[PDB]
Amino acid sequence: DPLKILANADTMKVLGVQRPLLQSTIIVEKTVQDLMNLMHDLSAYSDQFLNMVCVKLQEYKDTCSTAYRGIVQSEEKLVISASWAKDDDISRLLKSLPNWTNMAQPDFIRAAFGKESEVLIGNLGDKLIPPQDILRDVSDLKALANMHESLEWLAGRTKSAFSSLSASQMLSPAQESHVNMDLPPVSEQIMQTLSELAKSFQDMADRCLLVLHLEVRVHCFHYLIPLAKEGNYAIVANVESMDYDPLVVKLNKDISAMEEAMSASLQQHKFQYIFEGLGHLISCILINGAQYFRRISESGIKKMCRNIFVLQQNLTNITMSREADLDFARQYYEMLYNTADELLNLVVDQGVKYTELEYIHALTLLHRSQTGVGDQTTQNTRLQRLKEIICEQAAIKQAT
């Protein structure tokens, strides 16, 4: 219930908010408001009215926590995104990156994408994600999205209440050693309880947004990691067709459905935080995933390029900018059109662009797939010469 009924469109215009707010949040904030109004009139019972504010806010906090766990627990444990957000080290890293820190302000952020991708690839780049570890229903994602906006709003309202009380009774450090104790209209303990409820509503709001940000990314791994181990990219096709992976089609539908919900539930800069960076992550997934192919054929490369194109069109349309990292992943797979020897010539002619391991894994993939090399002794020799070509390129560049 408390994360379903949204406030009517005329309540938003009153409060001056341009995004859906939960009716339950509106109700508890109205009750706090009424309590705050009575403490100015019946100032003699200010403590009692304040204790009722804290209790009702604590009740709504507990009510939201319960609703959260119901969305986020699966088989008596957290889904991956929830597990990562709850984790201190991971949440600390994510909250320290410019895409979060500068979320509201209108390539440093592209380097922050590299850090998210590194953590995600490092821990998920070789894992099969079972269905019970992700959130499929957009209903749950939408519930998370306007729990975020609602609790962030409630945190702002609760913070204003605290600061109004604080400002009326604030003393300077020089005025402490003075005679007149007066009477603090509110005890420090009601103030501390109240300011912590405000922080708690913000922490809960931040968590929901983190979960949404990570959830789309985990979905990318769920659908794209099976891509490599399909045994479907080694087919020899003398004629070309518009065959591309159903998993990629499912990912696109998944991303689009989520894009639909977030746009109506979140402020734009929260929306952009969810969907920007997916291009970088997906390209990393596809480049890193090539090392799991047993065989690759020319038709398979054509199919992966269609996969990348389909994903590119969708993300470009969602983020309103071309995901250039997807071009980088396309160019990587186009390297596999070459022969094992031509691939080495490409590195000599145009320099080192991918990591050493990415080049080594490309050549090794070609050896497992192609036939224009022969015995293992010439393969080991070509592999060792590729490393020397990379060694030389580095030493040359560091000297100039």
Author numbering: 557 to 662, 674 to 967
Authors' account:
The exocyst is an octameric protein complex tethering secretory vesicles to the plasma membrane prior to membrane fusion. The interaction of SAP102 and PSD-95 with the exocyst is via one of its subunits, Sec8, which contains a consensus ITTV motif at the C-terminus for PDZ binding. Previous studies showed that the localization of PSD-95 and SAP102 to neuronal synapses is mediated by the exocyst complex; they together regulate the sorting and trafficking of N-methyl-D-aspartate receptors (NMDARs) from the endoplasmic reticulum (ER) and the Golgi apparatus to the synapse.
We determined a crystal structure for the C-terminal region of Rattus norvegicus Sec8 (aa556–975), which will be called Sec8c hereafter. The crystal belongs to space group I 422 (a = b = 190.004 Å, c = 175.275 Å), with two molecules in the asymmetric unit. One molecule contains aa557–661 and 674–967 of Sec8, and the other contains aa556–662, 675–732, 754–802, 808–936 and 944–967. The spacer is slightly shorter in the crystal structure, which was due to the lack of visible electron densities from residue K968 to the C-terminus. Overall, Sec8 is the only exocyst subunit that contains a rigid long spacer that bridges the PDZ-binding ITTV motif to the helical core structure.
